[PDB]
Curated annotation (Swiss-Prot), chains A, B:
The modification Phosphoserine is found at S83. The keyword Transcription applies. Methylation of H3R17 (H3R17me) by CARM1 is stimulated by preacetylation of H3 'Lys-18' (H3K18ac) H3 'Lys-23' (H3K23ac) by EP300 and blocked by citrullination of H3 'Arg-17' (H3R17ci) by PADI4. The gene is CARM1. It comes from Homo sapiens. The keyword Transferase applies. This is Histone-arginine methyltransferase CARM1.
């Protein structure tokens, strides 16, 4: 029917809203102090962006960002939420005596009707590696409700990528896969599935944190401007790169992280998930090559990271990389939807 | 329209078969040594139940059990598998040079055709707490292909339950929920949702192992005989109990585990997930009471554990219990499909 259901398979949506419908998941995000404190600070230090203004909160969850908008003096806040968390949010609005200012609207932002246009849209729509969930497209879709010259909080997003070396990680994944190399598992020859097995394990991005000393070159940055982007821009995301290698060694893959900026009238505030910054519930994300690349300090590692949105609220990631000085090439395809959550 | 599609919400089925389509999930079950080792022994040591026989493997996964049937000398094994793991099973049959004896049939056992009737059914259809996944119904459905007087491996399943005391596990729930008991979380009073957070945690069965010293009475068992049972017998499972308390203390809930028996012509072999036995991937399961019950040694703790099948491939669990000598009672509702995997 809607823009949402057209891009989203049934089973994915059901599973996705069940996950966010749990108080325990909302708590996990709320208790990321760097995340929640930075949102509150961006909003309160930019109070003139909220004072007597009309606000839309995309995917309000517990209602937390809407309470921050209210604290900053907003006249009216529409808090849209498609999971069963909406009913919990309406309980909090009543117990906090803000029924006159915060209006919970249950359902998908692609499907509801808002009574008026808004001055500013707030949301926390970043998945791991920024793009997981495809909730950035809901955030962009919501611009149908934004007044001309309205603002977006966050305003921009930067994705960073850098080559890394981590033989321990590589061998950890390699070792699980080589279960399927055994020629006599309880007398059975599994070895014909070894290739399929290496592919499966290496298709999984790795979600955890790491020491910055694994990084082999300065990060390449790709920027999404939320004020200017249309949701269609996010169907196919193409990030070319050329790294000037600062260290010699084996390149085991690319590491990803992201920052968003709240570009307000009074000040710009940054929220970062960089590995040089304090840890957040996003950690960082690594895509391994099953076939690692040898490079020397001063080489250039060049290629393309391509993200193709899929119906399961995620992206098919291809990473083609090469060491220019040798013509050594690595081609990889990752399933962002199904990663190894190594931090657990 | 099949028996399977009628009892199963489409979206639960998609998620279910995706999960089993991964080699790492198959690998997880395979590497449970007690599990895979015991299947192998039970089949090989009952070689006359297999020698020159026709076999059905219900949900073959990688094909592992079917290879054991072949090691035991079966003439023809039909291996049925609904996930994309069926492709991989096919590869292994080829590379193990058994195309003449193992026939992989892709699809649901409720929907495929077998070209002949079989002598024995083999399967591993046991979920956590035995009943999760509702695959025991697929196994029983498969008896439409069994020759009169054919056998089933496993032949019977016993679920055991027993009351437990575990003050620290009980406390953990309030510690977690009390996140919400704050009047000023970044300025927001979260207190109104504390009761809801408590109810959420108590609704999740706890999947983990424990020390046998927590158990307060001898277990009661409930037996399914796979040779005799019909599918409809598993839609509503009523387990009455009268525990004669061996220890005085505070009863915090019921612990569950299960055993299966392979009743062959040569010998009966048992596979136990009891807390007195080495750990398996099934662990054990505990259902908490939000109100604990005081009992002293000698008392009788009586009531009913009722499992009601649902269209998400699992059960709604109702546990009602009382201490006969005092009349104090506790009533609990759990969602077996969404437990707390405490062991992770
Ligand atoms: C499809 C999405 C909803 N999803 N599904 C499962 C899942 C997830 N886990 C964590 C480990 O347990 C299994 C599932 C973590 C995460 C996750 C991990 C790190 C950061 C994160 O950020 C969510 C944003 O705050 C939402 N805007 C989310 N996302 C998960
Ligand atoms: C819908 C069912 C298939 N399902 N879905 C997820 C899931 C699961 N996990 C593992 C923990 O992280 C989340 C998912 C474990 C298990 C699980 C846990 C313990 C034992 C177990 O045994 C499976 C049987 O051996 C299959 N015959 C399976 N089942 C899961
Ligand atoms: N299309 C859509 N319409 C409405 N809500 C959505 C949505 N897509 C995702 N959501 C909701 O958006 C939330 C993102 S998580 C962030 C929750 C909260 N604003 C906070 O910052 O703490 C989830 O609760 C999810 O259910
Ligand atoms: N109704 C059904 N029809 C066919 N296969 C099914 C099924 N329900 C579950 N399965 C398959 O049954 C398997 C259960 S796990 C057991 C796998 C394998 N027999 C082993 O012992 O290692 C999964 O691979 C699952 O996809």
């Amino acid at each position: 029917r809607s823009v949402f259901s057209e891009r989203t398979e049934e089973s994915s949506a059901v599973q996705y809203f069940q996950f966010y419908g749990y108080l325990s998941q909302q708590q996990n995000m709320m208790q990321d102090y760097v995340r929640t404190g930075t949102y509150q600070r961006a909003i309160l230090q930019n109070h003139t962006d909220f004072k007597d203004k009309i606000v839309l909160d995309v995917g309000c969850g517990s209602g937390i960002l809407s309470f921050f908008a209210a604290q900053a003096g907003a006249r009216k806040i529409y808090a849209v939420e498609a999971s069963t968390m909406a009913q919990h949010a309406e309980v909090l609005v009543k117990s906090n005596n803000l029924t006159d200012r915060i209006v919970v609207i249950p359902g998908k932002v692609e499907e509801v009707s808002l009574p008026e246009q808004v001055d500013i849209i707030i949301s926390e729509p970043m998945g791991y590696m920024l793009f997981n969930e495809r909730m950035l497209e809901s955030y962009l879709h919501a611009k149908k409700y934004l007044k001309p010259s309205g603002n977006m909080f966050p305003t921009i997003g930067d994705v960073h990528l850098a080559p890394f070396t981590d033989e321990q990680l590589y061998m950890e994944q390699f070792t699980k896969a080589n279960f399927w190399y055994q020629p006599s598992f309880h007398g059975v020859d599994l070895s014909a599935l070894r290739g399929a097995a290496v592919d499966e394990y290496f298709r999984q991005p790795v979600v955890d944190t790491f020491d910055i000393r694994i990084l082999m070159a300065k990060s390449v940055k790709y920027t999404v401007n939320f004020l200017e982007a249309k949701e269609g821009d996010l169907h196919r995301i193409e990030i070319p790169f050329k790294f000037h290698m600062l260290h010699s060694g084996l390149v085991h893959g690319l590491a990803f992280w992201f920052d968003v900026a709240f570009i307000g009238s009074i000040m710009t505030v940054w929220l970062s998930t960089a590995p040089t910054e304090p840890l957040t519930h996003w950690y960082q994300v690594r895509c391994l090559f099953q076939s690692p690349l040898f490079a020397k300090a001063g080489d250039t590692l060049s290629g393309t990271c391509l993200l193709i949105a899929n119906k399961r609220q995620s992206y098919d990631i291809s990473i083609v990389a090469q060491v220019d000085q040798t013509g050594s090439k690595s081609s990889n395809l990752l399933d962002l939807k199904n990663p190894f959550f190594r931090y657990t």
